[PDB]
Each structure stands twice: as structure tokens, then as C-alpha cells.
Amino acid sequence: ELTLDPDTANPRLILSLDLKGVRLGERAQDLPNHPCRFDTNTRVLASCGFSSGRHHWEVEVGSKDGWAFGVARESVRRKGLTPFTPEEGVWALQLNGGQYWAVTSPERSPLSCGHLSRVRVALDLEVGAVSFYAVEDMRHLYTFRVNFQERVFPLFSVCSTGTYLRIWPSVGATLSMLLQ
Numbered sequence: 001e002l003t004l005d006p007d008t009a010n011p012r013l014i015l016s017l018d019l020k021g022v023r024l025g026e027r028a029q030d031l032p033n034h035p036c037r038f039d040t041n042t043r044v045l046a047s048c049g050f051s052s053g054r055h056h057w058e059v060e061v062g063s064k065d066g067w068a069f070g071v072a073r074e075s076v077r078r079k080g081l082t083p084f085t086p087e088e089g090v091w092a093l094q095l096n097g098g099q100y101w102a103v104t105s106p107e108r109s110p111l112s113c114g115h116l117s118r119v120r121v122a123l124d125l126e127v128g129a130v131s132f133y134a135v136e137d138m139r140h141l142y143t144f145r146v147n148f149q150e151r152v153f154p155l156f157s158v159c160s161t162g163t164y165l166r167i168w169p170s171v172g173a174t175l176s177m178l179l180q
Contacts, residue, residue: 002057002154002167005047008078010038013158019047021166024066024158040081042179046154046167049074055123057154058135058168061095061116066160068094068103068180070144071123071130074151084180090155091130091144093119095163096177102132102142113141118168123152 003019014025022044031037038044059069068084070092082088085105094101094108100116101108118135128148132141156165159179 001169002046002048004044004156004167005036006044007032007034008036008038009044010040010042013042013044015044016166020168021164022156022158023164024161026161036078038078040079040179041084041157042159043072043155043157045072045156049151049153050123050125051151052125054126056120058118058120059156060118060166060168062163062165063115064160064163065096065098065176066158066163067165068092068157068159069119069165070103070121070132070155071152072155073148074153076153076155081179084157084177086144086146091146092155092157093132093141094177094180097173100141102144109142111141113139116141121154125152 004015006015011028011031012025014023073089076089092103094103100111100113116134120133120135122131129143129145131143157180
């Protein structure tokens with residue numbers, strides 16, 4: 001089963017003991033600087049990535065603002081403040097402003113999908129797509145079609161307190177997602 005990789009996690013994130021959950025903590029942990037660790041953006045990867053095939057997992061999502069999740073190409077930049085965009089190799093859904101978004105660029109796409117509790121992620125490296133479904137009726141949320149050219153990892157980001165993500169088998173607005 002998928003677990004979060006603590007060696008990639010931004011030091012302000014708090015991972016659960018079972019390595020399935022992530023939230024943002026108030027203080028930075030004193031962790032080893034590793035080239036794979038996100039040092040500024042509030043991100044963490046799963047410990048397993050995928051080069052081929054089709055893969056499912058489910059993500060339990062908090063009801064409040066501050067999370068984004070999906071997949072990232074392995075070469076996603078880890079160091080410095082980076083954009084949270086498809087150009088940087090992140091393909092994700094996000095909750096901010098009480099609104100669900102597919103994080104397209106240059107403008108994000110608002111989703112009129114109703115309340116989300118758990119989302120199934122379907123990664124298809126044979127055809128090149130990642131799709132998101134709400135589990136209670138499998139209604140489609142969004143699909144990114146991407147010609148992935150490298151290994152792809154489940155990706156999780158929490159940049160505000162008061163929300164979380166968990167694995168299962170104007171100015172103020174900008175600051176609120178700056179470190180996503």
C-alpha cells in the first residue's frame with residue numbers, strides 16, 4: 001500500500017505515525033537536508049512512483065481550505081519557492097476559498113462538484129492521463145491528459161493549518177496558496 005515518504009516532506013509538515021496522513025505544523029522540524037526534500041513548498045510525495053501501468057489510490061480530504069493533491073513528475077523541483085502549476089510537473093486538485101479547483105494554468109478551473117470527502121485518483125501511464133473521481137458516486141471531477149515522459153509520484157500539499165490529507169487504498173488569497 002502507498003505511504004508518504006518522510007524524506008521528501010517539507011519540515012513544517014506533520015506526517016502521521018502510519019505514514020498515511022499529512023497536515024501542516026506550526027514549527028519546522030530539524031530534519032536532514034536531502035536533495036529530494038521540499039524545502040519551501042509544503043509538499044510530500046509517496047514513497048512509490050510509477051513508470052508504467054495503471055494505478056488507483058484514494059485520498060481522504062479535509063473540509064477546510066489549504067490542501068492540494070494529485071501526481072507529480074519525479075523531476076518536480078524541490079528547492080526554493082516554486083510555482084504549483086502543470087508546467088512545473090504537478091497535476092492536482094485544490095481546495096481554496098471554499099471552492100474546489102483543478103489546478104490548470106494560467107487560470108485554475110473551478111469545479112462545480114459539491115462537497116468532497118474522499119477522492120479516487122486513477123493514474124494511467126499507458127495512455128497518459130490522471131483522473132479524479134468522488135468516491136460516493138464516482139462522479140468525474142477532472143482529467144489531465146499528459147504525455148508523461150518520466151516516473152510519476154502521488155503528490156500531497158497542505159499549506160494551511162486546519163486541514164489534512166490521508167491516503168486510502170487578492171493579497172490574502174495569494175498568500176494563502178503561495179507555498180502550495
